[PDB]
Amino acid sequence: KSLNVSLNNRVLSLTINRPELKNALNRELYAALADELERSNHDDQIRAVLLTANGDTFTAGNDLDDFINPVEESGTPSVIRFLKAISECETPIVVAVNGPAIGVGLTMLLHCDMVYASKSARFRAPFTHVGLVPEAASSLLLPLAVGQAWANDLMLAGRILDAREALSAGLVTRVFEDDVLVAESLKIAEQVASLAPNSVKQSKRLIRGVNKEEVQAQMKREGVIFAEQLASAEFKESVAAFFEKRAPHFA
Amino acid sequence: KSLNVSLNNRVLSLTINRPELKNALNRELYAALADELERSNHDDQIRAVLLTANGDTFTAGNDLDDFINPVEESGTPSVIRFLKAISECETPIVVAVNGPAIGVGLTMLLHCDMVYASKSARFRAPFTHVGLVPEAASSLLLPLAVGQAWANDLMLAGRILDAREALSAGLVTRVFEDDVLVAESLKIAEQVASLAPNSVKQSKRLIRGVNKEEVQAQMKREGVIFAEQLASAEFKESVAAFFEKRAPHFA
Amino acid sequence: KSLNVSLNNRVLSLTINRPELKNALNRELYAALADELERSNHDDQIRAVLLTANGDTFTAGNDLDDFINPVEESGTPSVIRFLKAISECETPIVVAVNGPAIGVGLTMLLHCDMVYASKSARFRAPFTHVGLVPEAASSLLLPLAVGQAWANDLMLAGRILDAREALSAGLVTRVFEDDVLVAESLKIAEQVASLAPNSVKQSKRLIRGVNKEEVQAQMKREGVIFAEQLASAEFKESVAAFFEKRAPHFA
Ligand code: NA
Ligand code: NA
Ligand code: NA
C-alpha cells in the first residue's frame, strides 16, 4: 500500500510509502490521506495522528505524471478532499519530517500541529521555479508561521532550508537524530492522545478558529490563479526547460 | 503584602510576593495587580511599569484552592479585572521573568511589552494536562508571538521551554544572568519612563490597536469553553490523577 | 546623483548615494525611489529590484533639515509617493542592508521581499526617542514580521539590533560578509528576474493581498498621530535636548 496505517494507544499512524518515487503524492495517496484524517474526526478513540514517511524523503511533492493526467476524476478531486480534511481536522497531528519536504510536502506542515524534523530534513516551496503559485493557503499561513522575510525567501526565491534553519525560523520546533525521530514523535503523539480528549479538541478548535474562514477563502483565491498558471505557456516552458536540460526563456 | 509596590523615577515596580506558594495567583493578588495597572493609566507621572516576582519562581500559575472556591466573589471576579487591566493598560510594561512562568504566568507576558528573562527562567502553558483550554486570549496571541508551530508545542503538547529556547522563538527578547535581571530591566523601564510620554502612549496604542477588539472577543470565546471544562469530569479527573499518583483515565 | 540606477539582466539596481549625509532620505531621494519603483511595475522587462546603499551606512533615516522645511511641496509629498510606490510595488524587491538602517531605513524593509544583510548591518526604529510614532505601517507589519516582543523592544525601547539578532528574530533571512553582500544579493535578484514573470508577480500578489488594505489604512492612522507629534512640544524638546547636550524634560 501507498499509505501504511496502524492504530495503537489511540494514535493513528500514517506513513507515506512510495519510496520508489520519493514519496511523490498522487491521486490514490491524497484520497487515502483524506480517508484516514476524516476517520480520525469521527472516531472518539482516535486522539492523535502521527504522520511520517518511509525512507530518506518526506515527500518530493506532486507526482508529475499524475499531475498532468488529462483524465479528470469522478466527484471531488482527491487533492481537494485532502486539503479540506487536513485543514479542518479536529484531531491533533504530530508530523515527523524524515527528509526533503518539497512543495506540498512543505505546505501540508502548516496544517499540522506539532512539527518535528530529522537532521537530514530539508524544506522547499519552489512554486515560482515551476511557474505556479502558492497552494494550501500557504500565501496566508507561511508568513504567519515564519514571518514575511522567511516566507518570501521560500516562496519567491526558492530557497532550500536545512533542519536547523527551519528550527531557527520556527517552521519546526524540534530536530532529532534520524534514527530516533519516529520513536520520539510517537511518544509525544501518545502523550497527547492520553490527555482529556475534549480539552485537546476544544483547545485546537480555539487556536484554529482564528483563521479558519480565511484559510478556506485563501485556498479558493490561490486555486483560481493556480489553475490558470497550470494551463499557461509559463508552466509548459518551466517544465520543458528542466527536461530539455536548458535555461528557460520567457520573452 | 502579596504584591510589593514602589514608585520611583516614574516607574511603578510591581513585585509578586507569595514565595511560600511559588507566587501562585489568587483573588487578592489579581485584585492588587488590577488596582496598580489601573493606577498607572490615570497617573500621568507613572510612565512605565516594571513587573517581577520574589525568589526562584515568576509564578507557578493559579492557586488551586482559591481556583475552586465555591464562595463566589462580590462584583467583577478579580481575575477578569486583571485580564482587562493588563490587556488594556496604556502604560508600557517591562516584565522580568526570574524563574518558571507557568499557565497564567506565561499568558500574562503576551500582554506585556518588553519581555525579558533570567537564565533560570522556564515557560509552560499546559492547559491540556489539566483538562482546560487557553485563556487571556493566548489562543490568538501566542501564535502571533512565536508562530503556529511553537504555539502548538506549548499549548497542545505541554512543552516546557528554557530561557534560550524562549529567546530563539521570540517569546522573550533578552536573557540575563539571574543576579542582574532586575537591575537591567529597571534601567530599561526608567529609560522608557524618561521619554516623551504622549509619543510612548500613542506608539503603544497604534501597536495594540491592531488586535485590540479581537483580543477582547477571543477572551469571551475562550471563557465560555473554559468555564465548561472547569466544571467537567475531565478537569476533576486530570487533577485527581495527579494527587492520587496515577495515570488519568478518559473513557 | 543621490540615487544611482542601472538596469541589466532584467534587474533594476537602485543604490542610495548620499554617503556624505550617511544616506539620509530627503525629498529628492524619496521622489527618485518612487519614480524607479513605479517604472518597475510598468516595464515588463524589469522583473526584480535590487536595493542597496553606498558606503558604511544603509540609511541614517530622515534628513533632519529637509524634515522640518517650512516650504511645503507641490502636489503629493515625495515621502507619501515613496511609501505608496514601495507598499504597492508588484515587482519583487531584494534589499541588501550594508550598514545601520535607522527609522525609515528599518521600516522600508517590511515592504521589501528578500531581506539580506551584511555582518556590519544594524537596525533601529527609535520613534519614541525623537517623540514621534511608527510610520510606513510598521505598527502593523513589524509585529507580524518578528513578533510582539521583538517589535516592542525595537519601537518602544529603542533597541539597536546587530545582523545576527535580526536574523534570529527573522527580520532578515541571510547575513553575508560585507565584501560579498552585493554580489550575492544581485545573483539572487537575477535568478528571480529569470523566472516565469506572471508566476512571480501573482505569487507576490497573493502574499501581499492578505494585508494590502490594512497596510494602507494603518499608514493613514499612523499619519494623523505622526503629524500631531511632529508639530508638538514633545518633538521640539526631544530634538532640542540632543543638540543642547542635555537630558530631555517632559513635565
Ligand atoms: Na477522534
Ligand atoms: Na500614566
Ligand atoms: Na515589471
PDB file of N, CA and C in Angstrom, chain C residues 195-226:
ATOM      1  N   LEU C 195      12.872  33.934 -13.729  1.00  0.00           N
ATOM      2  CA  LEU C 195      11.768  33.002 -13.544  1.00  0.00           C
ATOM      3  C   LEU C 195      10.553  33.487 -14.317  1.00  0.00           C
ATOM      4  N   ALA C 196       9.572  32.606 -14.476  1.00  0.00           N
ATOM      5  CA  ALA C 196       8.300  32.941 -15.137  1.00  0.00           C
ATOM      6  C   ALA C 196       7.710  34.220 -14.530  1.00  0.00           C
ATOM      7  N   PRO C 197       7.589  35.302 -15.333  1.00  0.00           N
ATOM      8  CA  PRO C 197       7.236  36.595 -14.759  1.00  0.00           C
ATOM      9  C   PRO C 197       5.863  36.686 -14.101  1.00  0.00           C
ATOM     10  N   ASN C 198       4.817  36.120 -14.729  1.00  0.00           N
ATOM     11  CA  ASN C 198       3.459  36.110 -14.128  1.00  0.00           C
ATOM     12  C   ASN C 198       3.371  35.211 -12.915  1.00  0.00           C
ATOM     13  N   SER C 199       4.088  34.087 -12.924  1.00  0.00           N
ATOM     14  CA  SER C 199       4.209  33.245 -11.716  1.00  0.00           C
ATOM     15  C   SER C 199       4.692  34.077 -10.524  1.00  0.00           C
ATOM     16  N   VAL C 200       5.774  34.818 -10.720  1.00  0.00           N
ATOM     17  CA  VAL C 200       6.378  35.614  -9.650  1.00  0.00           C
ATOM     18  C   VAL C 200       5.445  36.754  -9.244  1.00  0.00           C
ATOM     19  N   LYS C 201       4.974  37.535 -10.211  1.00  0.00           N
ATOM     20  CA  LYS C 201       4.066  38.652  -9.921  1.00  0.00           C
ATOM     21  C   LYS C 201       2.795  38.196  -9.166  1.00  0.00           C
ATOM     22  N   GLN C 202       2.134  37.131  -9.636  1.00  0.00           N
ATOM     23  CA  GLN C 202       0.926  36.599  -8.963  1.00  0.00           C
ATOM     24  C   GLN C 202       1.205  36.034  -7.573  1.00  0.00           C
ATOM     25  N   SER C 203       2.383  35.437  -7.420  1.00  0.00           N
ATOM     26  CA  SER C 203       2.747  34.841  -6.154  1.00  0.00           C
ATOM     27  C   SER C 203       2.898  35.940  -5.141  1.00  0.00           C
ATOM     28  N   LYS C 204       3.606  36.992  -5.527  1.00  0.00           N
ATOM     29  CA  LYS C 204       3.742  38.138  -4.620  1.00  0.00           C
ATOM     30  C   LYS C 204       2.395  38.775  -4.356  1.00  0.00           C
ATOM     31  N   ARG C 205       1.548  38.890  -5.379  1.00  0.00           N
ATOM     32  CA  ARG C 205       0.210  39.484  -5.185  1.00  0.00           C
ATOM     33  C   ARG C 205      -0.607  38.713  -4.129  1.00  0.00           C
ATOM     34  N   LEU C 206      -0.620  37.383  -4.220  1.00  0.00           N
ATOM     35  CA  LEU C 206      -1.296  36.539  -3.223  1.00  0.00           C
ATOM     36  C   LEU C 206      -0.740  36.754  -1.820  1.00  0.00           C
ATOM     37  N   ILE C 207       0.582  36.827  -1.690  1.00  0.00           N
ATOM     38  CA  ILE C 207       1.203  37.005  -0.392  1.00  0.00           C
ATOM     39  C   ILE C 207       0.837  38.391   0.195  1.00  0.00           C
ATOM     40  N   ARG C 208       1.014  39.434  -0.615  1.00  0.00           N
ATOM     41  CA  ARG C 208       0.769  40.807  -0.156  1.00  0.00           C
ATOM     42  C   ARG C 208      -0.719  41.118  -0.050  1.00  0.00           C
ATOM     43  N   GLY C 209      -1.545  40.392  -0.798  1.00  0.00           N
ATOM     44  CA  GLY C 209      -3.004  40.610  -0.782  1.00  0.00           C
ATOM     45  C   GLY C 209      -3.683  40.405   0.565  1.00  0.00           C
ATOM     46  N   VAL C 210      -3.075  39.612   1.444  1.00  0.00           N
ATOM     47  CA  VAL C 210      -3.698  39.335   2.734  1.00  0.00           C
ATOM     48  C   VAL C 210      -3.820  40.619   3.591  1.00  0.00           C
ATOM     49  N   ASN C 211      -2.777  41.441   3.648  1.00  0.00           N
ATOM     50  CA  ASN C 211      -2.817  42.660   4.448  1.00  0.00           C
ATOM     51  C   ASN C 211      -2.832  43.967   3.657  1.00  0.00           C
ATOM     52  N   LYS C 212      -2.979  43.880   2.346  1.00  0.00           N
ATOM     53  CA  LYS C 212      -2.861  45.042   1.464  1.00  0.00           C
ATOM     54  C   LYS C 212      -3.705  46.231   1.945  1.00  0.00           C
ATOM     55  N   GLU C 213      -4.996  45.999   2.184  1.00  0.00           N
ATOM     56  CA  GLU C 213      -5.922  47.081   2.577  1.00  0.00           C
ATOM     57  C   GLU C 213      -5.610  47.626   3.981  1.00  0.00           C
ATOM     58  N   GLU C 214      -5.314  46.729   4.937  1.00  0.00           N
ATOM     59  CA  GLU C 214      -4.978  47.171   6.288  1.00  0.00           C
ATOM     60  C   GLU C 214      -3.664  47.955   6.297  1.00  0.00           C
ATOM     61  N   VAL C 215      -2.715  47.627   5.417  1.00  0.00           N
ATOM     62  CA  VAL C 215      -1.441  48.383   5.342  1.00  0.00           C
ATOM     63  C   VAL C 215      -1.721  49.830   4.987  1.00  0.00           C
ATOM     64  N   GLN C 216      -2.551  50.069   3.960  1.00  0.00           N
ATOM     65  CA  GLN C 216      -2.909  51.440   3.574  1.00  0.00           C
ATOM     66  C   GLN C 216      -3.686  52.154   4.706  1.00  0.00           C
ATOM     67  N   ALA C 217      -4.672  51.482   5.312  1.00  0.00           N
ATOM     68  CA  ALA C 217      -5.426  52.094   6.421  1.00  0.00           C
ATOM     69  C   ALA C 217      -4.530  52.427   7.616  1.00  0.00           C
ATOM     70  N   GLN C 218      -3.598  51.542   7.957  1.00  0.00           N
ATOM     71  CA  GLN C 218      -2.703  51.776   9.089  1.00  0.00           C
ATOM     72  C   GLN C 218      -1.773  52.971   8.827  1.00  0.00           C
ATOM     73  N   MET C 219      -1.304  53.139   7.590  1.00  0.00           N
ATOM     74  CA  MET C 219      -0.478  54.324   7.265  1.00  0.00           C
ATOM     75  C   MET C 219      -1.239  55.596   7.476  1.00  0.00           C
ATOM     76  N   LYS C 220      -2.537  55.618   7.144  1.00  0.00           N
ATOM     77  CA  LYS C 220      -3.348  56.800   7.423  1.00  0.00           C
ATOM     78  C   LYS C 220      -3.549  57.008   8.927  1.00  0.00           C
ATOM     79  N   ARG C 221      -3.840  55.954   9.690  1.00  0.00           N
ATOM     80  CA  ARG C 221      -4.000  56.121  11.162  1.00  0.00           C
ATOM     81  C   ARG C 221      -2.704  56.651  11.796  1.00  0.00           C
ATOM     82  N   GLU C 222      -1.564  56.057  11.431  1.00  0.00           N
ATOM     83  CA  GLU C 222      -0.273  56.484  11.960  1.00  0.00           C
ATOM     84  C   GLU C 222      -0.012  57.941  11.585  1.00  0.00           C
ATOM     85  N   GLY C 223      -0.339  58.284  10.340  1.00  0.00           N
ATOM     86  CA  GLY C 223      -0.050  59.582   9.758  1.00  0.00           C
ATOM     87  C   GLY C 223      -0.656  60.752  10.510  1.00  0.00           C
ATOM     88  N   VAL C 224      -1.903  60.588  10.946  1.00  0.00           N
ATOM     89  CA  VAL C 224      -2.609  61.625  11.706  1.00  0.00           C
ATOM     90  C   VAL C 224      -1.903  61.883  13.040  1.00  0.00           C
ATOM     91  N   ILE C 225      -1.581  60.810  13.748  1.00  0.00           N
ATOM     92  CA  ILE C 225      -0.895  60.928  15.038  1.00  0.00           C
ATOM     93  C   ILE C 225       0.524  61.456  14.860  1.00  0.00           C
ATOM     94  N   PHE C 226       1.185  61.021  13.796  1.00  0.00           N
ATOM     95  CA  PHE C 226       2.545  61.467  13.480  1.00  0.00           C
ATOM     96  C   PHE C 226       2.611  62.973  13.263  1.00  0.00           C
TER      97      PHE C 226
END
